[PDB]
């Protein structure tokens, strides 16, 4: 492919990816809030039974976060980017890797609670 041949058509794909990047940031914020809540439950005065109820409510929320990240991946998976759209391809790969790193963090939470 040619050098410095950025095209208007690519801008359309890059805008789609930017909107997905922003949706990922919002989901990530939800993950950080869930992380804070989990710490709070652990450092709180809830007795065993109420602690379990609070961790299982937190579990449903972590399952919701995982699902949102999965829907983002399914959305990114609809993209077909020509080999010449190097910048879009780099952005798509980086975003998928970022989502997969957040999914691994969700998994650490989800498997540590409401067993």
């Amino acid at each position: 492919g040619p050098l410095g041949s950025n095209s208007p058509q690519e801008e359309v794909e890059l805008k789609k990816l930017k909107h997905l990047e922003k949706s990922v940031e919002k989901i990530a914020d939800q993950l950080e809030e869930l992380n804070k809540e989990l710490t709070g439950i652990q450092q709180g005065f809830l007795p065993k039974d109420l602690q379990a109820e609070a961790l299982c409510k937190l579990d449903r929320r972590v399952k919701a976060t995982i699902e949102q990240f999965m829907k983002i991946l399914e959305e990114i998976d609809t993209l077909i980017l020509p080999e010449n759209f190097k910048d879009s391809r780099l952005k798509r790969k980086g975003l998928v890797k970022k989502v997969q790193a957040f999914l691994a963090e969700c998994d650490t939470v989800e498997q540590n609670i409401c067993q």
Binding site: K57, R60, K63, A64, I66, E67, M70, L73, E74, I76, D77, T78, L79, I80, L81, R92, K93, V96, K97, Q100, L103
Partner: protein, 378 residues
């Protein structure tokens, strides 16, 4: 407020209204012309339609679907006993009657199939009201031609629980025939074959129409056959391709299989109007990108047995109706999977190049005909 036509399907439902000399299929709150026949029970609420289907992966045990496979049946019915194995939700026996058992607002609750179906009907009613900006009370609700008295009555009960005045219950193949106006054609008795392949079921019905009297001559089909099976064959094909190219098995990674399956369902739809489809999935498994394509011909080979298999029911229904294939005046395609060119080709070739009735959206034809009948009864 006018009268509506509602197609209550196993996996998807559809509502239509006849206005300004034309039938309007009504889009739901999410803009979809069809709504999942799903009801989900959560700690904080009850979800219906797209909202219920959208959280199925999160809450599989408490999300109900396929109520139509249980409605009006006894618990010991073979269909109830066989179908239970495939559902993530609990089905219990309440004095010979099946009930679906779920966790709802921190409590173990059970519902009769007509109650689950009434919730789906409530959603279809609400969908119509949101579009029309008028109250909707009257409706024509469709049922499969093989439904018995119990199943028909239980469907009517679902309408009544939902606050609907169920004007009439009509068979799904009758609704499909009505949409195409096959009862309005002048001449002798007309033999109509309805080929219905949608929502996970395959139903073939032969009807004879004469002076507006619809006679169901025969019914045949497969209880479990549809788009999910065709997607599965493409998933197998891709999993094998990934093993050949990378010597890695992605089958045990549920997320990798899901991303692949979602892409396959989309590629299959592209294959109904294009001869090739491409898929690009970054970091599918173990950081490996999977960029591939599939031709319509390969998709057809992967599904050869299933596609050819659809003619067995057609042959069975013809033999039960005591009719030669040349005695069939009209053929109607119903259900989303009838959009598959190979399925259309097999059916047209079996009927010696006869043209198929397919101009009406296959997913919408049953609701369309029910909306026509609801207008006539207004």
């Amino acid at each position: 407020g006018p009268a509506v036509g509602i197609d209550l399907g196993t996996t998807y439902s559809c509502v239509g209204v006849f206005q300004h000399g034309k039938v309007e299929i009504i889009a739901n709150d999410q803009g979809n012309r069809t709504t999942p026949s799903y009801v989900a029970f959560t700690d904080t609420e009850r979800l219906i339609g797209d909202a219920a289907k959208n959280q199925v992966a999160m809450n599989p045990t408490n999300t109900v679907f396929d109520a139509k496979r249980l409605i009006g049946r006894r618990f010991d019915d073979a269909v109830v006993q066989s179908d239970m194995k495939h559902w993530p939700f609990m089905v219990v026996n309440d004095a010979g009657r099946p009930k679906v058992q779920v966790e709802y607002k921190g409590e173990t609750k059970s519902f009769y199939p007509e109650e689950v179906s009434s919730m789906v009907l409530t959603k279809m009613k609400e969908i119509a009201e949101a579009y029309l900006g008028k109250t909707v009370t009257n409706a024509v609700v469709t049922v499969p031609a093989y439904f018995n008295d119990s199943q028909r009555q239980a469907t009517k009960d679902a309408g009544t629980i939902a606050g609907l005045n169920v004007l009439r219950i009509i068979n799904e193949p009758t609704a499909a025939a009505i949409a195409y106006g096959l009862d309005k054609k002048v001449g002798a008795e007309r033999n109509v074959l309805i080929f219905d392949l949608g929502g996970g079921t395959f139903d073939v019905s032969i009807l004879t129409i004469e002076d507006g009297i619809f006679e169901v001559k025969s019914t045949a089909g497969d209880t479990h056959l549809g788009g999910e099976d065709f997607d599965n064959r493409m998933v197998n094909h891709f999993i094998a391709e990934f093993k050949r190219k990378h010597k890695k098995d992605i089958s045990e990674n549920k997320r990798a299989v899901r991303r692949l399956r979602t892409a396959c369902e989309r590629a299959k739809r592209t294959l109904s109007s294009s001869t090739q489809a491409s898929i690009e999935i970054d970091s599918l498994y173990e950081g490996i990108d999977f960029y591939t394509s599939i031709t319509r011909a390969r998709f057809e080979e992967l599904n050869a047995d299933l596609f050819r298999g659809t003619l067995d029911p057609v042959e069975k229904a013809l033999r039960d109706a005591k009719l030669d294939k040349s005695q069939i005046h009209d053929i109607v395609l119903v259900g989303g999977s009838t959009r598959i060119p190979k399925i259309q080709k097999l059916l047209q070739d079996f009927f010696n190049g006869k043209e198929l009735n397919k101009s009406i959206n296959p997913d919408e034809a049953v609701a369309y005909g029910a909306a026509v009948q609801a207008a006539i009864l207004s």
